[PDB]
Hints:
Chain A is mostly helical. In chain A, 68% of the residues lie in helices and 8% in strands.
Amino acid sequence: TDILREIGMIARALDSISNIEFKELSLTRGQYLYLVRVCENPGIIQEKIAELIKVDRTTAARAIKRLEEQGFIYRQEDASNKKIKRIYATEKGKNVYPIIVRENQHSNQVALQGLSEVEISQLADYLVRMRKNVSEDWEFVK
Amino acid sequence: TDILREIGMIARALDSISNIEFKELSLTRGQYLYLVRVCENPGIIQEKIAELIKVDRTTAARAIKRLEEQGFIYRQEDASNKKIKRIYATEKGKNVYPIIVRENQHSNQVALQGLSEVEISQLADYLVRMRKNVSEDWEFVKKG
């Protein structure tokens, strides 16, 4: 099979599922990805967020603004440097985060059905290496 | 290691690379995905393309609509049912398709650097299983 094509189909199917199940939480269209990174990294900046999620800064910028408008996060300029805008989860964001975490844990269980622990262990090694290979190529292309 | 987290980062990284490299070819934002499926499946219907690419029917309709506007594909209405449209690549779509095919092949080579033939074969098997797993779950979720 086409390895990258399979990876893309897995990613898009998961995204399509989330657009349905997170509809009532207003975290569709990948919004939950951003909230998860903000909750795991209080005080993080837009630039770093895009780096982690692997998207362009304009894309990340729009996602963050939307999350703010929906009340999941808030931003605060640094007193020292006005240029640094730190992102934090609001009470609402910290409230829904756990559901997203558990839903993600469930998605993994669904995706990994049929695979044993040692098989999942090898898979993990291959994927991390691929992610590193592709992330580096992205930097190079950027 | 969060397996799906890795899968997601790899997919988004590739998408981000495509948005830069296909910019002059008018195929960014995943548009190349639809052109490829159309060239691989001449005459395919919108419903089926969304199923293969794993997206909702409206997202696919939007992508297919943009491809038509940018002259990559055309849609012919079925004689028995005007609402059914078979999608075909235009001359422009066919001319560009090969470039996309080779660019995707290059992306796989970059991604798989270091992995042996045997490891890649095992990976392929694991990914096919995963894809079937999540595809059926999506199908179930959709059949609400």
